[PDB]
Nucleic acid binder design. Structure first.
Length: 66
DNA sequence: AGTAACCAATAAATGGTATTTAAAATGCAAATTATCAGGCGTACCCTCTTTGCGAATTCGCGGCAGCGG
């Protein structure tokens, strides 16, 4: 239920990701293969029980949870 | 005051094939205390004596026994 069990740093990376950052630049910046980047975003997608980032980002912003 | 599905394009849509990471936790077998379980010994003198009293008045039957011509 609670996102904070995950690392805050990856949450900040994720906010940057939802700021329009494409996966290629993500892999280039984070020093991992694109496969690992996709695996990470896939993990975040199911762990938040979401189908798309738009609704989750809007919900995070509106109540200013983090 | 606004028609398109044209053909590329964009990476996101997944759920699937693995050598990793070390931390944890989870088990594992020692050391190290308590406590239990056996053995021995005892120098005034003491000497068959306790029992069962009756698996309790059955009875009827059988037979293997000792005495006996």
């Amino acid at each position: 239920r609670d996102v904070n069990q995950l690392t805050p740093r990856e949450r900040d990376i994720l906010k940057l990701i939802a700021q329009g950052l494409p996966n290629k630049m993500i892999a280039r910046r984070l020093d991992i293969t694109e496969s690992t980047v996709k695996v990470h975003v896939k993990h975040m997608l199911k762990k938040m029980k979401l189908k798309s980032r738009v609704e989750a980002a809007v919900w995070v912003h509106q109540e200013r949870i983090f």
